[PDB]
Write a protein that binds this ligand. Structure first.
Ligand code: HEM
Ligand SMILES: [C-]#N
Length: 212
């Protein structure tokens, strides 16, 4: 079974639980305000910063290299733009770093530094999502908060180097299937992907609580 198919099958159940989390359920209904949105994007800033720091550390490692797409996928630069937009010139000392966010970042550094063969699980979980539901969320955020078509405040959801997200995702899945794969690696990679989804669910459950 190709890795791409194994991952989709392994995470299809938790995805349902994730897309139906209270925070997302509300976001999807159009109920999202500046306060809540700033909280989630600030958290993503930390998460992608850690993820991409580990991707850079392992860019030459064969267990990840085929998926090294900085120009097309990396979001840190975009998030820094969004942070300046929502938090101002000195966003660095203004943005929050929640416990659930720190927990996610901790696992990212553990994987990148000690279990690099599992890093693919984390890139898959975040990036393929950004190119899927993330695109639907972007439209909802624009409408709800009156954000301009010019893109300010939503740089994170914008991929100027990807003309067709559908085509790129297919390309990415195909590349994932070129990775050296063994029962051991495939089993653990799908398990880490489920863990990645849980880290996201816990983040959203935390943020929802902070708001309420
Ligand atoms: C806001 C609620 C969500 C919506 C509306 C949503 C919707 C979708 C849709 C429509 C797809 C299918 C795209 C395709 O087949 O190419 C998809 C796939 C995916 N989503 Fe979500 N999603 C949501 C939440 C999440 C969350 C919280 C995560 C985890 C960070 C996530 C990660 C993924 C991944 C990794 C895929 C790709 C699965 C695969 O093709 O193997 N999604 N999502
Ligand atoms: C999917 N987001």
């Amino acid at each position: 079974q190709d890795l791409s198919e194994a991952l989709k099958e392994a995470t299809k159940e938790v995805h349902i639980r994730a897309e139906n989390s209270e925070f997302m359920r509300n976001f999807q209904k159009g109920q999202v305000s500046r306060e809540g949105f700033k909280l989630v994007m600030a958290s993503l800033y930390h998460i992608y910063t850690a993820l991409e720091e580990e991707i850079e550390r392992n860019k030459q490692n064969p267990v990840y290299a085929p998926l090294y797409f900085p120009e097309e996928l990396h979001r840190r630069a975009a998030l820094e733009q969004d942070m300046a937009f929502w938090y101002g010139p000195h966003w660095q000392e203004a943005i929050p770093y929640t416990p659930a966010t720190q927990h996610y970042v901790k696992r990212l550094h553990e994987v990148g530094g000690t279990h690099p063969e599992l890093l693919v699980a984390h890139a898959y979980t975040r990036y393929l999502g950004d190119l899927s539901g993330g695109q639907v969320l972007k439209k909802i955020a624009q409408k709800a908060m009156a954000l301009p078509s010019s893109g300010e405040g939503l740089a994170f959801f914008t991929f100027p180097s990807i003309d067709n997200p559908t085509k790129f995702k297919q390309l990415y899945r195909a590349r994932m299937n070129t990775l050296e794969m063994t029962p051991e690696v495939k089993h653990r990679v799908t398990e880490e992907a489920k863990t990645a989804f849980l880290l996201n669910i816990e983040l959203f459950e935390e943020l929802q609580a902070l708001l309420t």
